[PDB]
Amino acid sequence: QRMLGFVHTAQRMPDKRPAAERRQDFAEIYARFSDERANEQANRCSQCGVPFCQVHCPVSNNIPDWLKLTSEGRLEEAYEVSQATNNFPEICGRICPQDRLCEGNCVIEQSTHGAVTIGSVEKYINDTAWDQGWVKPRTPSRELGLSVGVIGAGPAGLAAAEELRAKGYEVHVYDRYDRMGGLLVYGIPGFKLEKSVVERRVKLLADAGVIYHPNFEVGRDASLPELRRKHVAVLVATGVYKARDIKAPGSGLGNIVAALDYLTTSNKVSLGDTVEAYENGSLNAAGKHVVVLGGGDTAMDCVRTAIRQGATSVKCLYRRDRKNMPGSQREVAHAEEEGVEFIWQAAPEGFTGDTVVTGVRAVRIHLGVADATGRQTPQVIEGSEFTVQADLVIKALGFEPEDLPNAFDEPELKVTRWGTLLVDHRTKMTNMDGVFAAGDIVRGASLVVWAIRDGRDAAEGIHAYAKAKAEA
Ligand SMILES: Cc1cc2nc3c(=O)[nH]c(=O)nc-3n(C[C@H](O)[C@H](O)[C@H](O)COP(=O)(O)OP(=O)(O)OC[C@H]3O[C@@H](n4cnc5c(N)ncnc54)[C@H](O)[C@@H]3O)c2cc1C
Ligand code: SF4
Ligand code: SF4
Secondary structure (H helix, E strand, C coil): CCCCCCCCCCCCCCCCCCHHHHCCCCCCCCCCCCHHHHHHHCCCCCCCCCCHHHHCCCCCCCHHHHHHHHECECHHHHHHHHHCCCCCHHHHHHHCCCCCCCCCCCHHHHCCCCCCCHHHHHHHHHHCCCCCCCCCCCCCCCCCCCEEEEECCCHHHHHHHHHHHHHCCEEEEECCCCCCCCHHHHCCCCCCCCHHHHHHHHHHHHHHCCECCCCCCHHHHCCHHHHHHHCCCEEECCCCCEECCCCCCCCCCECEEEHHHHHHHHHHHHHCCCCHHHCCCCCCCCCCEEEEECCCHHHHHHHHHHHHCCCCEEEEECCCCCCCCCCCCHHHHHHHHHCCEEECCEEEEEEEECCEEEEEEEEEEEECCCCCCCCCCEEEEEEEEEEEECCEEEECCCEECCCCCCCCCCCCCCECCCCCECCCCCCCECCCCCEEECCCCCCCCCCHHHHHHHHHHHHHHHHHHHHHHHHC
16 A cells, blocks of 8 residues: 555554563563554655764665565565665664664654654564565585685674575685674573574574684684684674673672673573573572662663572662663663662662672762753762662673783784774774674673674775785
8 A cells, every 4th residue: 555654553562471470471561463453564764865863874775665565564675674774684673672773763753753663564574574485595606725714603694694694605614602692692681682593593593604603712822923824814803792890888798790791691591501500600699689889781681580590589780860861761661660670860879798699889970061062061969879678789880992902912903992802984994904893892891783794894894905905
């Protein structure tokens, strides 16, 4: 039908399970659209000129085109259009925060008509295509005689590997873990993204012809000059893993565990491998009171994965207001509905205890009015300082890059202050010849789709450089 039906229809997301039932299991919380409902929700588009849904999507899919090709049957052509510009569409549709990228700037969203549910239609059109064999690996026609190396198996690494293998090269990936996929499989919990689609996509990648090297750290089992001599070009996509800390009176007691360790062990125990720290360790929250520090999406993941495993009472201390939350806002409402209690504008001061933490003494800060440059300056209130009973606290402040030049044996890699190495904009080439670096280690605490775009751009640049070098 002529697809301008936002006038006489109302937006409604797919099926959801109630809160009293969500708290038990570890599966997802949403469901896939039905056919007659997807063909209706994809019809509310307006095919507007100058589509803001595409200007603000970091990978810049052709959103109106497959929204049209979905609203008229014709699902296979829609799958083609969607896949031809994005390597992991379903993963993006599942995890990408849409209220700030695409759904937050739709033209009918700016006019209080609600937003066309884009990511859910992405999921629908990209998963119903998987069941009927419309997905196939991109095996190169004529195998080109060159070899390219990458470091890391995250989103950027896998995207670059797929692009290079499609061009015709021979790729070799080098991941530190045993199950490749990066923090897509060890950072993000199960209820957000299921660990089955990730292994499905990595199996497809391996079927395309990629060679996998698990349990292979660059620092220990290799060296950057050796790999530089092996292949023709290497892509540093190792991400950021050196976490942050806090120095306060009482910050040396027991049961003060970093967030990444907790999340990793939760992912493992959901998969298996029977780590002992889940049996006898401080990485369980069965019958304890949990308190997490800092904000962001990491805080949301931690608090939810804690409230799933019992956790008689959970609290989260953010040191700003609610509207400045770094992550999305659907997960905040989800956590509130599931049982979490939030404490906005609070900063930790100390930990009271003897050998194990018994409580967290915190202060209450006040934010000034936005400055002429758009920056609020908080100041701690002198009177109100309080203490919360805490059985297990989790520090989830942030993440920073490691010291790569002093660990990759090459002290000539140019670096900024924070650790993100410098790189040109066009070719995505590192200071040194032959080596390239693009992904999350160049940006900071970005999202997945930015990593995908950086990986694709670095792949194109590496192809151009290798062709120009073997050319003459
Ligand atoms: C919805 C959402 C939720 C998010 N949740 C989180 C979250 O909970 N926590 C979080 O931290 N980020 C989170 N992010 C951020 C995002 O996941 C990452 O910034 C991004 O995925 C990292 O991209 P990358 O290319 O650096 O890959 P990464 O996955 O960051 O790359 C890590 C890989 O590098 C490998 N590696 C590391 N060091 C070495 C080495 N020396 N040698 C070899 N291999 C090495 C690791 O083993 C791993 O395979 C989230 C993003 C979104 C959109
Ligand atoms: S969601 Fe809105 S802006 Fe995006 S294509 Fe549809 S009508 Fe245009
Ligand atoms: S990748 Fe993210 S921003 Fe782009 S269309 Fe999909 S959900 Fe929207």
